[PDB]
RNA sequence: AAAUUGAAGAGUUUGAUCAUGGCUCAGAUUGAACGCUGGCGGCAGGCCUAACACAUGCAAGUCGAACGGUAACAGGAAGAAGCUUGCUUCUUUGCUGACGAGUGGCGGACGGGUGAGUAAUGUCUGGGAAACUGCCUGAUGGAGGGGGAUAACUACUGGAAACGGUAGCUAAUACCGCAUAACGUCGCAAGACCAAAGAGGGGGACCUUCGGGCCUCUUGCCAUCGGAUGUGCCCAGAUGGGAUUAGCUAGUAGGUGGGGUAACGGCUCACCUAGGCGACGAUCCCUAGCUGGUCUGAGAGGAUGACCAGCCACACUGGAACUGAGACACGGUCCAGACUCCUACGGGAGGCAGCAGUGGGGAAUAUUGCACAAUGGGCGCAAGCCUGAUGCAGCCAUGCCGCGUGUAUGAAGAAGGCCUUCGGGUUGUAAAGUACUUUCAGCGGGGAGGAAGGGAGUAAAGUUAAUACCUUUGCUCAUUGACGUUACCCGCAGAAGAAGCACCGGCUAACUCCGUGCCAGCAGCCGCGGUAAUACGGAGGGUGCAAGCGUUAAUCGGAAUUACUGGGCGUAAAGCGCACGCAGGCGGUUUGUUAAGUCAGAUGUGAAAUCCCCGGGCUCAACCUGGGAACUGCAUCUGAUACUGG
């Protein structure tokens, strides 16, 4: 980039980046962990991993890598989801 | 911007005084006042219904020393003020301050009021005017100022005006060297072998 | 956000301001929302120069929109007047 | 606080919706003649219970698909 | 009170006529150019062409009151000394006024440029429902206790440069757990789950580890429900042409369910139904940003979309997402393309449709200027810093408006020129002479306003333990203008420095002589030129304009010459060679009904500017400005039912 913020905003969006991507990365693995349950029909196991993915779609829409809705479908999908079964 | 040329041929050409000269004299003894300017000035003008349009349109505009420009565009005011067009005309020349000066008497033609309006040598309300077209209101105060009442040229002004007839809508003293503008003319205060019916006729076409 | 101030019209060397409540992003003699006074700096002040519907200003003020070190003095200046 | 169409049904063929014809007249522009206009809506019925050529009454409302954003508010006449 | 209360015709077909019909002219208008000419000023305008390519500067920063900090300069200091004993230079140490580089915060999504693309994820009018929304704002509560890192820096090392590699090492409002957790999210509920951060100013007992504790106020941080502003989304109507384009369509149209978004949705996927669009113009092709408005017209229309303002779209070309409240980012990132620059040859760098400026194209369009003083934007508690936004200045008669280039007197009316029947006429009061004025330009002298604020003190209130601090409001003191030699006023010198352009056969205001001889040439249309040419060219005279005047280009007008208002088809252009007939248009007469068309009223909206009316301000005018009227339109509701429709 030419003008010295815009070399510096380069560098911060890319930590940020690798950051959210981490953090973003973890999440979709406990959310894919609750669909991989109750695609094989355990209630238990499903409803476990909703409660380890609970607290962390709720944590990471308060920390703006997501907003509150996509947290919400998020639990009411499953939620819906896994009742329905057992 | 102003015509500088010879006067009397323009008086000439119209076929009657314009008062472009003092009127010290018999406007016959200072040229052949009956006889169009040139080589075939005595030849007769058999004369179109356009002809006849321009030269009055002209007319006026060489009394009042307007160039086309600023008399079409006091044609355009006319227009859009209201009542009869043609006499609207003749109230925006005749309020003029370069005319009003001249009428007052403080200058021998409307061309010497206008070298004293744009030489500062004229007061409007104790205020200095010093554009000829500035336009004169009602009640207004128009005064030689101090510095240019000593000038013979007002006295000599002063003189020849109080043997004109002496305009109605205008009180003036001639010892203060002030006037005050007290109405618009009517049309009948002014001279009733101008046609602005004409002039009217020419700029509507 | 939403500021009162001044947008300039009127001729060169003869400003002439509008004031303005708007988006406080857009340009200057841009986009708008709502006219609330003017301020002539030049008024010859034997008659008026500044009117401000101050009824308006405050409602806005009340809703959050903010105000010009200008438009603030004119307030103050228009409210010692009367 | 109501506002409605009136219209009547040109297609009842598809599920649970209905294609409406709202029929006006309308002054030209230029030449002052009154022509006939006509606007298809595709509407929603659930239950499909409006047959083709009736005569519906129908209301606006939120995206139902990529083209439907009114529904069925009643049947006004029927099987002309 | 006023506020669309307005409308012209001429030349040219014929021997002549009337009609038909085209061509042409008088008018307004222009972002103009060219030819001749050219004094001043105010206001405006200024690449219409190559969305061609761009050297150089500048156009986005700021906060030390988040943070470790010193390298510059500035003081200060135990202690070195300049020592001529209070003046001091340097060695030192961030002690502090500040501040390069770094982390961090907020801004780089605004402001500014362009109109390529787009006949619709556009615009205009009018409505909807499923949403987010930094800064600012109201409400109610949090702001507890911890942890591991890292740039800077240090050491070693690679590069010509750009920029790297190792290992150390450290701070925070960087980053992550843990606790706390409802008027929040999920859930019928029971329950389950989610956050954070400090930093400053001042201080009375009181005292220590002299850091501060603690007291106090400012400010920032977290949560939730609101307000305001911004934005996303959906529907209807309108918004160019072409049928020498008639059929178009597989995510296609809908349904179910999963996924997805901030949110509704074929947004996406699977399955199912077989739909959806189209002669009321789909599809395809050509062209194009839309609007307020602008120009023209009496109007209805026609033409148009610079300058100002609103919306959209784009940022070298094609594609992509990352960060973020906001971008698929105008001076950010990545990939590919086209192109250019640097290189020590191995490798690097960039994108003026920001402001100046350059090459190129063109009939043609400006200075590589001054200033943040004013308005406004970013950051900051502030002071302030940044701001080619903006305010100004330069260039160009490009346009509009204003003024000047003198005023008065001046006759047998000179000389010269021109015509003349040689009598005289004209140029012409024109010139010379005579007085007289001095705007503007020149030169000196003086001197408003655009300035509000901000800074020291002071005093009072609200604060509080407090007279601190903070904040508000009065007071005094000293101050802030790029423009600028400002506007404007006074003085000096002298008419002194300031007039050209086109036209004069009819249309059309203005006539003669000489030259030429169907030549040279003119020409908007008719038409001029072979010996008297007011038509060519020169002259004298005249007409029209005037710092301009002509020519060319261009829109509308006149053109009732696309005729809705407002025309025609026997012989002038125009009845299909004739009939049947789908779609379509139109449809006799009565009653009832309906209330879409139509009509009425009410309400909302129709941005501001512009136009118009009456006022106000610059000496006037252009110009600036207050208020009104107007926006003849759209939409909702409620009525009326004669006519049209059902
Ligand atoms: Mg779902
Ligand atoms: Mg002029
Ligand atoms: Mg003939
Ligand atoms: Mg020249
Ligand atoms: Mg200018
Ligand atoms: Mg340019
Ligand atoms: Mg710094
Ligand atoms: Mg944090
Ligand atoms: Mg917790
Ligand atoms: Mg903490
Ligand atoms: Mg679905
Ligand atoms: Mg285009
Ligand atoms: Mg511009
Ligand atoms: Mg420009
Ligand atoms: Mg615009
Ligand atoms: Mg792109
Ligand atoms: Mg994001
Ligand atoms: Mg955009
Ligand atoms: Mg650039
Ligand atoms: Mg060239
Ligand atoms: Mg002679
Ligand atoms: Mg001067
Ligand atoms: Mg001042
Ligand atoms: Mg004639
Ligand atoms: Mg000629
Ligand atoms: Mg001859
Ligand atoms: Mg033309
Ligand atoms: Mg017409
Ligand atoms: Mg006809
Ligand atoms: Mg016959
Ligand atoms: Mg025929
Ligand atoms: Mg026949
Ligand atoms: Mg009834
Ligand atoms: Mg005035
Ligand atoms: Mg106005
Ligand atoms: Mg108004
Ligand atoms: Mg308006
Ligand atoms: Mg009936």
Not at chain 2, 77 to 90: D, I
Not at chain 2, 99 to 116: H, K, S
Request: aromatic share 6%; glycine share 6%.
């Amino acid at each position: 980039a030419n003008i010295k913020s815009a070399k510096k905003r380069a560098i911060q969006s890319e930590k940020a980046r690798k950051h959210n991507a981490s953090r973003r990365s973890m999440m979709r693995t406990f959310i894919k962990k609750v669909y991989a349950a109750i695609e094989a029909g355990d209630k238990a196991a499903a409803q476990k991993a909703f409660n380890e993915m609970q607290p962390i779609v709720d944590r990471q829409a308060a920390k703006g890598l997501i907003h509150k809705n996509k947290a919400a479908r998020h639990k009411a999908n499953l939620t819906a989801q896994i009742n329905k079964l057992a | 911007a102003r015509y500088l040329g010879p006067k009397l041929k323009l008086s000439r050409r119209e076929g009657t005084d314009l008062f472009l000269k003092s009127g010290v004299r018999a406007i016959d003894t200072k040229c052949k006042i009956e006889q169009a300017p040139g080589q075939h000035g005595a030849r007769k003008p058999r004369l179109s219904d356009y002809g006849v349009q321009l030269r009055e349109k002209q007319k006026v505009r060489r009394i009042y020393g307007v160039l086309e420009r600023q008399f079409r565009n006091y044609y355009k005011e006319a227009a859009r003020l209201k009542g009869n067009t043609g006499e609207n005309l003749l109230a925006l020349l005749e309020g003029r301050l370069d005319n009003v000066v001249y009428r007052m008497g403080f200058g021998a033609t409307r061309a010497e009021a206008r070298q004293l309006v744009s030489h500062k040598a004229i007061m409007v309300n104790g205020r200095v005017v010093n554009i000829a077209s500035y336009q004169v209101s009602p009640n207004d105060v128009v005064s030689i100022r101090e510095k240019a009442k000593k000038q013979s040229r007002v006295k000599a002004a002063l003189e020849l005006a109080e043997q004109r007839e002496k305009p109605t809508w205008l009180e003036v003293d001639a010892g203060k060297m002030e006037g005050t503008f007290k109405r618009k003319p009517e049309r009948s205060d002014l001279s009733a072998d101008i046609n602005e019916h004409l002039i009217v006729e020419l700029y509507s076409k | 956000m939403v500021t009162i101030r001044l947008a300039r019209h009127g001729a060169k060397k003869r400003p002439f301001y509008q004031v303005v409540v708007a988006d406080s992003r857009n340009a200057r003699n841009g986009r708008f929302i709502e006219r609330v006074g003017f301020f002539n700096p030049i008024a010859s002040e034997k008659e008026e120069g500044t009117r401000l519907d101050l009824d308006r200003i405050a409602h806005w003020v009340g809703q959050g929109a903010t105000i010009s070190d200008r438009v603030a003095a004119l307030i103050k200046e228009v409210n010692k007047a009367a | 606080k109501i506002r409605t169409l009136q219209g009547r049904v040109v297609s009842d063929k598809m599920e649970k919706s209905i294609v409406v014809a709202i029929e006006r007249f309308v002054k030209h522009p230029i030449y002052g003649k009154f022509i006939k206009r006509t606007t298809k809506l595709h509407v929603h019925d659930e239950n499909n219970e409006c047959g083709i050529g009736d005569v519906v009454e129908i209301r606006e409302c939120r995206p139902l698909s990529k083209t439907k954003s009114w529904t069925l508010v009643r049947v006004v006449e029927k099987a002309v």
